[PDB]
Design a binder for this molecule. Structure first.
Ligand SMILES: O=S(=O)(NCc1ccccn1)c1ccc(Br)c2ccccc12
Ligand SMILES: O=S(=O)(NCc1ccccn1)c1ccc(Br)c2ccccc12
Lengths: 172, 172
């Protein structure tokens, strides 16, 4: 399935999973890692997911997102998200933690808002794969949060939306 | 938004919402109604969603679905669903309650399986809208269940998948 790494992909990603997606958890925390294969070039995928100011273009569940205007997003910037009705959250204030255009790493922390999550922090990495003439992408996204099944579903569906957007753009 | 009826659509659907999607609840039950606009002909939408034997073609979260072979699905037939890993459910046995090809109504009850829901029953109706040269669809899906936010998310995402499939098929 597009969310289940092949053994070859898992072997190639061993160092990245260790570097960014493995947690030494206190007894009051939990973590989760999700993967998504995308049949599009990794720089295209990265160009979408790196836009911290426009999460609604690659995520579900967002009614609106406010950032300061006329300013290029950089580490430390925040965004104010209104979550669509019907979820265990109404707003989220989120800080951009990582924006590495060379390595294709981004991540954010939820620092405020009306919701149930304490100390949520996530990291997303975008990886290039190639075999014969064919180049594809794997996206890894993990989070840690204080004490899961709902957040897992949000991440999985968001990664699938990112796949749908990138593959739509890649059609020739 | 595609999940929020216009006042005109809501007025046109008043009788259908009363007929199929309104519940006289005991204190131990709850219900929820979801809507999805689809920019495709209603008979195309119906041809997809009526396939009780192939829910994985218009729903998320399904690893596999087993039905008896060499038999046209009809009211009373059951399906055995395995839910993908990571959800508050592992299996679901579901009975087809309604299959009305003239009125475009279907529905099912969850009668067994390893999951947390008691007495879940849902009904889905497919509606034709037309204004000037333009014909579109609204799908309504409601459920009742014994004592919500997770089931609401499942229904909303499934209706959105149905929209994506039908609109992909309708492109000329
Ligand atoms: O604002 S968010 O888009 N943040 C991104 C996000 C948050 C949690 C998991 C994955 N990704 C958001 C969406 C859905 C839920 Br449920 C949330 C619940 C609490 C806080 C924020 C929530
Ligand atoms: O097998 S299902 O595809 N049934 C369809 C369904 C079930 C519940 C709501 C909407 N639609 C399924 C999917 C996801 C969850 Br969470 C379920 C949890 C319990 C039982 C079945 C579940």
């Amino acid at each position: 399935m597009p969310s289940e790494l092949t053994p070859e992909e898992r072997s190639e990603l061993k160092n990245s999973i260790a570097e960014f997606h493995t947690y030494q958890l206190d007894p009051g925390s939990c973590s989760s890692l999700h993967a998504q294969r995308i049949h599009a070039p990794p720089e295209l995928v990265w160009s979408i997911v790196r836009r911290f100011d426009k999460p609604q273009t690659y995520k579900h569940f967002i009614k609106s997102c406010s950032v300061e205007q006329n300013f290029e997003m950089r580490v430390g910037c925040t965004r104010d998200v209104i979550v669509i009705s019907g979820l265990p959250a109404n707003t989220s204030t989120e800080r951009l933690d990582i924006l590495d255009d060379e390595r294709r790493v981004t991540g954010f922390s939820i620092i405020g808002g009306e919701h149930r999550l304490t100390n949520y922090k996530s990291v997303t990495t975008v990886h290039r794969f190639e075999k014969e003439n064919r180049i594809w992408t794997v996206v890894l996204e993990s989070y840690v949060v204080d004490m899961r099944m709902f957040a897992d579903t949000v991440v999985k569906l968001n990664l699938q939306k990112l796949a749908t957007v990138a593959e739509a753009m890649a059609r020739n």
